[PDB]
Scaffold this active site. Structure first.
Site, PDB file in Angstrom:
ATOM      1  N   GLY A   1      30.412  -4.926  -6.027  1.00 45.72           N
ATOM      2  CA  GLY A   1      30.597  -3.684  -5.254  1.00 45.72           C
ATOM      3  C   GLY A   1      29.354  -3.248  -4.516  1.00 45.72           C
ATOM      4  O   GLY A   1      28.375  -3.980  -4.531  1.00 45.72           O
ATOM      5  N   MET A   2      29.434  -2.088  -3.866  1.00 47.63           N
ATOM      6  CA  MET A   2      28.302  -1.415  -3.189  1.00 47.63           C
ATOM      7  C   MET A   2      27.271  -1.000  -4.243  1.00 47.63           C
ATOM      8  O   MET A   2      27.662  -0.728  -5.385  1.00 47.63           O
ATOM      9  CB  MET A   2      28.791  -0.172  -2.441  1.00 47.63           C
ATOM     10  CG  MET A   2      27.744   0.458  -1.547  1.00 47.63           C
ATOM     11  SD  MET A   2      27.108  -0.670  -0.286  1.00 47.63           S
ATOM     12  CE  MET A   2      28.619  -1.483   0.242  1.00 47.63           C
ATOM     13  N   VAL A   3      25.995  -0.959  -3.860  1.00 47.47           N
ATOM     14  CA  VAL A   3      24.884  -0.412  -4.685  1.00 47.47           C
ATOM     15  C   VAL A   3      24.261   0.767  -3.944  1.00 47.47           C
ATOM     16  O   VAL A   3      24.041   0.647  -2.714  1.00 47.47           O
ATOM     17  CB  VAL A   3      23.821  -1.479  -4.975  1.00 47.47           C
ATOM     18  CG1 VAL A   3      22.725  -0.934  -5.879  1.00 47.47           C
ATOM     19  CG2 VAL A   3      24.455  -2.728  -5.556  1.00 47.47           C
TER      20      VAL A   3
ATOM     21  N   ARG B   1      13.311 -12.087  -2.574  1.00 49.54           N
ATOM     22  CA  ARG B   1      14.348 -11.054  -2.278  1.00 49.54           C
ATOM     23  C   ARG B   1      14.971 -10.500  -3.570  1.00 49.54           C
ATOM     24  O   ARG B   1      15.697  -9.497  -3.487  1.00 49.54           O
ATOM     25  CB  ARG B   1      15.430 -11.621  -1.349  1.00 49.54           C
ATOM     26  CG  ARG B   1      16.207 -12.790  -1.924  1.00 49.54           C
ATOM     27  CD  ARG B   1      17.222 -13.356  -0.963  1.00 49.54           C
ATOM     28  NE  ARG B   1      17.859 -14.404  -1.733  1.00 49.54           N
ATOM     29  CZ  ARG B   1      17.532 -15.694  -1.732  1.00 49.54           C
ATOM     30  NH1 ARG B   1      16.587 -16.166  -0.931  1.00 49.54           N
ATOM     31  NH2 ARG B   1      18.179 -16.525  -2.536  1.00 49.54           N
ATOM     32  N   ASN B   2      14.746 -11.153  -4.709  1.00 46.21           N
ATOM     33  CA  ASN B   2      15.300 -10.709  -6.011  1.00 46.21           C
ATOM     34  C   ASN B   2      14.173 -10.173  -6.904  1.00 46.21           C
ATOM     35  O   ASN B   2      14.481  -9.680  -7.998  1.00 46.21           O
ATOM     36  CB  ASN B   2      16.112 -11.826  -6.678  1.00 46.21           C
ATOM     37  CG  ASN B   2      17.512 -11.966  -6.113  1.00 46.21           C
ATOM     38  OD1 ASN B   2      18.091 -10.990  -5.665  1.00 46.21           O
ATOM     39  ND2 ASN B   2      18.066 -13.171  -6.111  1.00 46.21           N
TER      40      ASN B   2
ATOM     41  N   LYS C   1      24.703   0.342  -9.388  1.00 44.63           N
ATOM     42  CA  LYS C   1      25.639  -0.706  -8.894  1.00 44.63           C
ATOM     43  C   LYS C   1      27.048  -0.373  -9.399  1.00 44.63           C
ATOM     44  O   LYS C   1      27.180   0.176 -10.515  1.00 44.63           O
ATOM     45  CB  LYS C   1      25.211  -2.124  -9.288  1.00 44.63           C
ATOM     46  CG  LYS C   1      24.351  -2.248 -10.535  1.00 44.63           C
ATOM     47  CD  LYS C   1      24.604  -3.475 -11.386  1.00 44.63           C
ATOM     48  CE  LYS C   1      25.057  -4.696 -10.631  1.00 44.63           C
ATOM     49  NZ  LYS C   1      24.836  -5.887 -11.471  1.00 44.63           N
TER      50      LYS C   1
ATOM     51  N   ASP D   1      17.830  -8.970  -9.697  1.00 41.66           N
ATOM     52  CA  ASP D   1      18.945  -9.761  -9.118  1.00 41.66           C
ATOM     53  C   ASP D   1      19.772  -8.797  -8.276  1.00 41.66           C
ATOM     54  O   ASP D   1      20.297  -7.803  -8.835  1.00 41.66           O
ATOM     55  CB  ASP D   1      19.823 -10.420 -10.202  1.00 41.66           C
ATOM     56  CG  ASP D   1      20.858 -11.478  -9.699  1.00 41.66           C
ATOM     57  OD1 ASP D   1      21.201 -11.454  -8.490  1.00 41.66           O
ATOM     58  OD2 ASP D   1      21.267 -12.356 -10.509  1.00 41.66           O
TER      59      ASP D   1
ATOM     60  N   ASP E   1      18.392 -17.857  -9.369  1.00 38.84           N
ATOM     61  CA  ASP E   1      18.239 -17.362  -7.970  1.00 38.84           C
ATOM     62  C   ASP E   1      16.923 -16.585  -7.863  1.00 38.84           C
ATOM     63  O   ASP E   1      16.885 -15.556  -7.150  1.00 38.84           O
ATOM     64  CB  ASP E   1      19.446 -16.536  -7.505  1.00 38.84           C
ATOM     65  CG  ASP E   1      19.411 -16.130  -6.038  1.00 38.84           C
ATOM     66  OD1 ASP E   1      18.930 -16.914  -5.202  1.00 38.84           O
ATOM     67  OD2 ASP E   1      19.842 -15.003  -5.746  1.00 38.84           O
TER      68      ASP E   1
ATOM     69  N   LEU F   1      22.258   1.301  -0.980  1.00 38.38           N
ATOM     70  CA  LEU F   1      21.164   0.335  -1.247  1.00 38.38           C
ATOM     71  C   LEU F   1      21.542  -1.059  -0.731  1.00 38.38           C
ATOM     72  O   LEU F   1      20.634  -1.756  -0.263  1.00 38.38           O
ATOM     73  CB  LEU F   1      20.823   0.334  -2.745  1.00 38.38           C
ATOM     74  CG  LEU F   1      19.695   1.261  -3.223  1.00 38.38           C
ATOM     75  CD1 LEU F   1      18.881   0.564  -4.307  1.00 38.38           C
ATOM     76  CD2 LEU F   1      18.760   1.712  -2.109  1.00 38.38           C
ATOM     77  N   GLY F   2      22.816  -1.447  -0.799  1.00 39.00           N
ATOM     78  CA  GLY F   2      23.253  -2.792  -0.379  1.00 39.00           C
ATOM     79  C   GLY F   2      24.581  -3.198  -1.018  1.00 39.00           C
ATOM     80  O   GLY F   2      24.980  -2.667  -2.085  1.00 39.00           O
ATOM     81  N   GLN F   3      25.199  -4.234  -0.412  1.00 39.20           N
ATOM     82  CA  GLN F   3      26.408  -4.914  -0.938  1.00 39.20           C
ATOM     83  C   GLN F   3      26.021  -5.806  -2.128  1.00 39.20           C
ATOM     84  O   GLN F   3      25.443  -6.908  -1.894  1.00 39.20           O
ATOM     85  CB  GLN F   3      27.082  -5.728   0.170  1.00 39.20           C
ATOM     86  CG  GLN F   3      28.398  -6.369  -0.250  1.00 39.20           C
ATOM     87  CD  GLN F   3      29.460  -5.325  -0.476  1.00 39.20           C
ATOM     88  OE1 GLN F   3      29.685  -4.465   0.372  1.00 39.20           O
ATOM     89  NE2 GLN F   3      30.105  -5.377  -1.631  1.00 39.20           N
ATOM     90  N   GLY F   4      26.329  -5.324  -3.345  1.00 39.97           N
ATOM     91  CA  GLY F   4      26.336  -6.091  -4.608  1.00 39.97           C
ATOM     92  C   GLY F   4      27.559  -6.987  -4.709  1.00 39.97           C
ATOM     93  O   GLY F   4      28.523  -6.783  -3.928  1.00 39.97           O
TER      94      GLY F   4
HETATM   95  C1  LIG Z   1      21.722  -4.645  -7.850  1.00 37.81           C
HETATM   96  C2  LIG Z   1      20.644  -4.154  -8.820  1.00 37.81           C
HETATM   97  C3  LIG Z   1      20.653  -2.620  -8.949  1.00 37.81           C
HETATM   98  C4  LIG Z   1      20.765  -4.882 -10.149  1.00 37.81           C
HETATM   99  O1  LIG Z   1      21.763  -4.845 -10.869  1.00 37.81           O
HETATM  100  N1  LIG Z   1      19.607  -5.497 -10.396  1.00 37.81           N
HETATM  101  C5  LIG Z   1      19.316  -6.260 -11.460  1.00 37.81           C
HETATM  102  C6  LIG Z   1      20.261  -7.131 -11.999  1.00 37.81           C
HETATM  103  C7  LIG Z   1      19.942  -7.920 -13.093  1.00 37.81           C
HETATM  104  C8  LIG Z   1      18.663  -7.866 -13.646  1.00 37.81           C
HETATM  105  S1  LIG Z   1      18.268  -8.859 -15.005  1.00 37.81           S
HETATM  106  C9  LIG Z   1      17.122 -10.157 -14.403  1.00 37.81           C
HETATM  107  F1  LIG Z   1      16.033  -9.591 -13.896  1.00 37.81           F
HETATM  108  F2  LIG Z   1      17.694 -10.879 -13.463  1.00 37.81           F
HETATM  109  F3  LIG Z   1      16.803 -10.962 -15.418  1.00 37.81           F
HETATM  110  C10 LIG Z   1      17.704  -7.017 -13.116  1.00 37.81           C
HETATM  111  C11 LIG Z   1      18.031  -6.215 -12.024  1.00 37.81           C
HETATM  112  C12 LIG Z   1      18.761  -5.302  -9.367  1.00 37.81           C
HETATM  113  O2  LIG Z   1      17.622  -5.770  -9.254  1.00 37.81           O
HETATM  114  N2  LIG Z   1      19.304  -4.533  -8.429  1.00 37.81           N
HETATM  115  C13 LIG Z   1      18.667  -4.138  -7.169  1.00 37.81           C
HETATM  116  C14 LIG Z   1      17.651  -2.998  -7.284  1.00 37.81           C
HETATM  117  C15 LIG Z   1      17.224  -2.507  -8.508  1.00 37.81           C
HETATM  118  C16 LIG Z   1      16.277  -1.475  -8.565  1.00 37.81           C
HETATM  119  N3  LIG Z   1      15.778  -0.930  -7.466  1.00 37.81           N
HETATM  120  C17 LIG Z   1      16.186  -1.385  -6.258  1.00 37.81           C
HETATM  121  N4  LIG Z   1      15.866  -1.059  -5.008  1.00 37.81           N
HETATM  122  C18 LIG Z   1      16.547  -1.832  -4.159  1.00 37.81           C
HETATM  123  C19 LIG Z   1      17.308  -2.653  -4.854  1.00 37.81           C
HETATM  124  C20 LIG Z   1      17.109  -2.415  -6.148  1.00 37.81           C
END
Ligand SMILES: CC1(C)C(=O)N(c2ccc(SC(F)(F)F)cc2)C(=O)N1Cc1ccnc2[nH]ccc12
Ligand code: NI
Length: 278
Positions: free
Chosen positions: A28-30, A147-148, A50, A161, A143, A22-25
């Protein structure tokens, strides 16, 4: 803390498989994958996993779980749902709802070769739902960009995120003074000057997300460098109304980019503002 104490959110490595990447977290890798016995009424569930670097320190592993322990408190359909933790075992994992259409910046760029006020206003409302929830559970995202924001099979938008280390959005970060990465193009004046991240500074970033949707994820302040962005925004410079931008949407942008952070609206106020129109 110095420690992480496993709880009932724990789920056995057995039941996690990983498919593509999925991408570089940050830690680590996701990867995409599948997970069993994590939403009962569903035998298998499609997840994002992740991972923690094999190399990466223990105090870095603690640092990684304690951020995903924050998500255990949450219960909002417009914030990416935590499904599990896999701390006991070598590759230290966190499992999460899979958002099939990936991140909102790729989705908007995928529409270049208009979208309706309605359809844009919708995304804005779904993003502001999540963000209102977060600011209320005393979470400052610091952030918030397109993109997030993460998109669902049904085209529903959830706050996420994916961190700062993805090759694909490198242009979107500046190592200011050569320290940590900063998403300067999205940052409030006060966040640029003094390093002040607030609900209010999230409302500034939300105004840039509105700008991203209207432009289909053009680079904010195109043709300025990061040092020039700093100066421009710290001096009350603002973004140009996108071409073909509806009046109603550009008025949210302005509101969100008041220099004075106490002049800007709350997410709650933003949700109100759009909700009269639907
Ligand atoms: C890297 C990972 C997996 C993750 O850890 N998070 C995440 C981290 C913290 C919060 S808490 C908030 F929202 F910031 F308050 C929410 C999500 C993601 O969005 N990611 C990406 C992700 C989630 C799902 N599908 C995806 N497709 C393509 C990417 C992707
Ligand atoms: Ni909704």
């Amino acid at each position: 803390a110095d420690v992480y104490v496993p709880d009932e959110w724990e789920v056995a490595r057995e039941k996690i498989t990983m498919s593509r990447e999925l991408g570089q977290g940050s830690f680590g890798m996701v990867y995409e994958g599948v997970a069993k016995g994590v939403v009962k009424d569903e035998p298998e569930t499609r997840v994002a996993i992740k991972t923690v670097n094999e190399a990466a320190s223990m105090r870095e592993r603690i640092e990684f779980l304690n951020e995903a322990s924050v998500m255990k408190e949450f219960n909002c359909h417009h914030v990416v749902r935590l499904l599990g933790v896999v701390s006991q075992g070598q590759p230290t994992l966190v499992i999460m709802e899979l958002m099939t259409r990936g991140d909102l910046k790729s989705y908007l760029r995928s529409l270049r070769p208009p979208p309706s006020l309605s359809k844009m206003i919708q995304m804005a409302g779904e993003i502001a739902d999540g963000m209102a929830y977060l600011n209320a559970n005393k979470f400052v995202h610091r952030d918030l960009a397109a993109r997030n924001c993460m998109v669902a099979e049904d085209f529903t938008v959830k706050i996420g995120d994916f961190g700062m280390t993805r090759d694909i959005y490198e242009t979107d970060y500046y190592r200011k003074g050569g320290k940590g990465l900063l998403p300067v193009r999205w940052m409030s004046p006060e966040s640029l000057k003094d390093g002040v991240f607030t609900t209010y500074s999230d409302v500034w970033s939300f105004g840039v997300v509105l700008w991203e949707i209207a432009t289909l994820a053009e680079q904010p302040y195109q043709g300025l460098s990061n040092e020039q962005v700093l100066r421009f925004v710290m001096e009350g410079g603002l973004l140009d109304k996108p071409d073909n931008c509806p009046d109603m949407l550009f008025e949210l942008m302005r509101m969100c980019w008041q220099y004075n952070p106490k002049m800007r609206p709350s997410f709650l106020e933003i949700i109100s503002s759009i909700k009269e129109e639907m």
